[PDB]
Every structure is written in structure tokens, then in C-alpha cells.
Design an enzyme around this catalytic site. Structure first.
Site, PDB file in Angstrom:
ATOM      1  N   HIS A  94       0.820  -1.202   0.000  1.00  0.00           N
ATOM      2  CA  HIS A  94       0.000   0.000   0.000  1.00  0.00           C
ATOM      3  C   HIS A  94       0.864   1.266   0.000  1.00  0.00           C
ATOM      4  O   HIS A  94       0.304   2.364  -0.179  1.00  0.00           O
ATOM      5  CB  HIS A  94      -1.016   0.009   1.159  1.00  0.00           C
ATOM      6  CG  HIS A  94      -0.490   0.275   2.525  1.00  0.00           C
ATOM      7  ND1 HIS A  94      -0.247  -0.733   3.453  1.00  0.00           N
ATOM      8  CD2 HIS A  94      -0.252   1.439   3.172  1.00  0.00           C
ATOM      9  CE1 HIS A  94       0.201  -0.162   4.587  1.00  0.00           C
ATOM     10  NE2 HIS A  94       0.153   1.146   4.454  1.00  0.00           N
ATOM     11  N   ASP A 126      -0.092  -7.708   1.375  1.00  0.00           N
ATOM     12  CA  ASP A 126       0.359  -6.327   1.498  1.00  0.00           C
ATOM     13  C   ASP A 126       1.883  -6.316   1.695  1.00  0.00           C
ATOM     14  O   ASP A 126       2.387  -6.072   2.795  1.00  0.00           O
ATOM     15  CB  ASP A 126      -0.362  -5.602   2.632  1.00  0.00           C
ATOM     16  CG  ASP A 126      -0.160  -4.092   2.657  1.00  0.00           C
ATOM     17  OD1 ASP A 126       0.418  -3.556   1.665  1.00  0.00           O
ATOM     18  OD2 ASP A 126      -0.562  -3.444   3.645  1.00  0.00           O
ATOM     19  N   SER A 179       3.393   2.083   8.487  1.00  0.00           N
ATOM     20  CA  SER A 179       3.294   1.239   7.301  1.00  0.00           C
ATOM     21  C   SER A 179       4.651   0.742   6.815  1.00  0.00           C
ATOM     22  O   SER A 179       5.552   1.549   6.581  1.00  0.00           O
ATOM     23  CB  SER A 179       2.610   2.008   6.187  1.00  0.00           C
ATOM     24  OG  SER A 179       1.273   2.380   6.506  1.00  0.00           O
TER      25      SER A 179
HETATM   26  C1  LIG Z   1      -0.544   1.413   9.192  1.00  0.00           C
HETATM   27  C2  LIG Z   1      -1.810   1.506  10.002  1.00  0.00           C
HETATM   28  C3  LIG Z   1      -1.714   1.078  11.317  1.00  0.00           C
HETATM   29  C4  LIG Z   1      -2.779   1.142  12.202  1.00  0.00           C
HETATM   30  C5  LIG Z   1      -3.976   1.635  11.795  1.00  0.00           C
HETATM   31  C6  LIG Z   1      -4.164   2.058  10.462  1.00  0.00           C
HETATM   32  C7  LIG Z   1      -5.428   2.545  10.051  1.00  0.00           C
HETATM   33  C8  LIG Z   1      -5.640   2.923   8.766  1.00  0.00           C
HETATM   34  C9  LIG Z   1      -4.621   2.866   7.833  1.00  0.00           C
HETATM   35  C10 LIG Z   1      -3.340   2.465   8.169  1.00  0.00           C
HETATM   36  C11 LIG Z   1      -2.333   2.484   7.037  1.00  0.00           C
HETATM   37  N1  LIG Z   1      -2.908   2.779   5.718  1.00  0.00           N
HETATM   38  C12 LIG Z   1      -3.212   4.025   5.172  1.00  0.00           C
HETATM   39  C13 LIG Z   1      -3.078   5.325   5.844  1.00  0.00           C
HETATM   40  O1  LIG Z   1      -3.870   6.275   5.640  1.00  0.00           O
HETATM   41  O2  LIG Z   1      -2.088   5.413   6.720  1.00  0.00           O
HETATM   42  C14 LIG Z   1      -3.812   3.852   3.961  1.00  0.00           C
HETATM   43  C15 LIG Z   1      -3.862   2.463   3.689  1.00  0.00           C
HETATM   44  C16 LIG Z   1      -4.332   1.700   2.618  1.00  0.00           C
HETATM   45  C17 LIG Z   1      -4.228   0.320   2.657  1.00  0.00           C
HETATM   46  C18 LIG Z   1      -3.672  -0.315   3.761  1.00  0.00           C
HETATM   47  C19 LIG Z   1      -3.218   0.420   4.850  1.00  0.00           C
HETATM   48  C20 LIG Z   1      -3.311   1.802   4.802  1.00  0.00           C
HETATM   49  C21 LIG Z   1      -3.076   1.993   9.519  1.00  0.00           C
END
Ligand SMILES: Cc1cccc2cccc(Cn3c(C(=O)O)cc4ccccc43)c12
Ligand SMILES: [Zn+2]
Length: 226
Positions: free
Chosen positions: A45, A89, A182
Site C-alpha cells: 500500500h 500487502d 506502514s
Molecule cells: C498502518 C496503520 C496502522 C494502524 C492503523 C491504520 C489505520 C488505517 C490505515 C493504516 C495504514 N494505511 C493508510 C493510511 O492512511 O495510513 C492507507 C492504507 C491503505 C491500505 C492499507 C493500509 C493503509 C493503519
């Protein structure tokens, strides 16, 4: 990282800070880790039109001699990555040149063994991500110790799968990976076993990590061909 501590500077020399360019919005950021001198592992992602990797960082606002800013020549996103389920992912980034080895920059290669990691133990994750829902990404590398949970703790993520993913962080605590973390490694006794993937928007743990053991064949196939 929510509820963690500041890392000792340069104590995790494989950590990578990714700046992600898209055609239709400003820069976004992720973590990652150096597994070969010219390959970084991260989350799918985190893909974009182009990416730049900074190795050797602690405070990402303060340039220093330890920094290596490196061009990515090609992104290898897992071919089965699914934007609906979020399965698979995982992504490899090939760097245009091999990084320099210094005290502050080094690889974290996988050991030969690829055993399935069961629930119960404590592991550690690092990142430059947000330190709370309403808070901005940390200027300094942060880290936190989290409990591997039984898969039923992640049931509410309806596309979670125990074979593909780790369930990480006791729900009774605030401690968690979060947005901006991430792609960072989850280390269990010094061995990378997970990759930060996703969680709840309100930051309540547990969060979902990619289970590296499942993807070891794919990782090997990309490395050997490139
Ligand atoms: C890393 C993480 C940890 C904990 C809670 C989270 C809650 C939401 C999103 C994320 C990380 N994230 C994002 C973003 O906006 O950061 C977009 C996106 C798209 C596909 C997958 C993951 C994704 C989170
Ligand atoms: Zn320094």
C-alpha cells in the site's frame, strides 16, 4: 508509534524512511527495512509513481552525515495484492545502487529458518508514524514492545487471516503501530517476522501485520531474478 519510546539513535541501522510521490496529491511517507544492500522490504500500500529511500536517519528533519538518500529504480508489488481485502500487502524496492555499509546503515537478512510464529510472545516495531489519532508523524524514530495475540483477537477485521497475517497489540493497552508506520518490521528476538499493514482509524489495538514466513518463497524469487 503510539505509546512507545524514542529509539537510541542509529540503533536499528536497517530502518528505511520512504517518501512516496503520486501524480495527484502531495508526498506521503512509510517505513521499510534494508534486507540487501540494494533491496528494501515494505508494504504494497506504500506503492506510488516514484519513491525515495533515506537510510541512516534518526531525526528526519535534521540532515546529517549518516544519511544516504537513495533512488528506487523499480517497485515489485506483490502481484496478488488486493485493495479490498488487503491480502498480500508486501512490496520489494530495488535501489539504483547498493547502499554504503556504515555503523548507522546495514542489512537485516533473513535466517535460513522460516518457522510459523505462534501467538504469545513479545515483539518490537519501530517507525516515524503518528503518535496518536490527532498527532502528526514523529520527527524521531520511535519504537514499542507489543504482544502477539491469538487470531480471534483480530476477528473484527473481517478479511483478517491467521495464515497470512499476525495479530499484534494487547487491546487493554494503547501501545500500537499506527498510520505512517506502514511497511516497518516487527522483530521477535531480533528476527523480522512481520510488516506493519493496517488497523483501526481510532488506533485501538490490535493491528494487522503481514506474516513474513508465508512470503519467504516470493521474496526469494524476486531477489534471485533481479
Ligand atoms: C498502518 C496503520 C496502522 C494502524 C492503523 C491504520 C489505520 C488505517 C490505515 C493504516 C495504514 N494505511 C493508510 C493510511 O492512511 O495510513 C492507507 C492504507 C491503505 C491500505 C492499507 C493500509 C493503509 C493503519
Ligand atoms: Zn546521527
Amino acid at each position: 508509534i503510539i505509546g512507545g519510546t524514542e529509539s537510541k539513535p542509529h540503533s536499528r541501522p536497517y530502518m528505511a524512511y520512504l517518501e512516496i510521490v503520486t501524480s495527484n496529491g502531495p508526498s506521503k511517507f512509510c517505513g521499510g527495512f534494508l534486507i540487501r544492500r540494494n533491496f528494501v522490504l515494505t508494504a504494497a500500500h506504500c506503492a506510488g509513481r516514484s519513491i525515495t529511500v533515506t537510510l541512516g536517519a534518526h531525526n528526519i528533519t535534521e540532515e546529517e552525515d549518516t544519511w544516504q538518500k537513495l533512488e528506487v529504480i523499480k517497485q515489485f508489488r506483490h502481484p496478488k495484492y488486493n485493495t479490498s481485502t488487503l491480502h498480500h500487502d508486501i512490496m520489494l524496492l530495488k535501489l539504483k545502487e547498493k547502499a554504503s555499509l556504515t555503523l548507522a546503515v546495514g542489512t537485516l537478512p533473513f535466517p535460513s529458518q522460516k518457522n510459523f510464529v505462534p501467538p504469545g510472545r513479545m515483539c518490537r516495531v519501530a517507525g516515524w508514524g503518528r503518535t496518536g489519532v490527532l498527532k502528526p508523524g514523529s520527527d524521531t524514530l520511535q519504537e514499542v514492545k507489543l504482544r502477539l495475540m491469538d487470531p480471534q483477537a483480530c476477528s473484527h477485521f473481517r478479511d483478517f487471516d491467521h495464515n497470512l497475517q499476525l495479530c499484534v497489540g494487547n487491546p487493554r493497552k494503547t501501545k500500537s503501530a499506527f498510520k505512517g508506520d506502514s511497511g516497518g518490521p516487527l522483530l521477535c528476538a531480533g528476527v523480522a517476522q512481520g510488516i506493519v499493514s493496517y488497523g483501526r482509524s481510532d488506533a485501538k489495538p490490535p493491528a494487522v501485520f503481514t506474516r513474513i514466513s508465508h512470503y519467504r518463497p516470493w521474496i526469494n524469487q524476486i531477489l534471485q531474478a533481479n
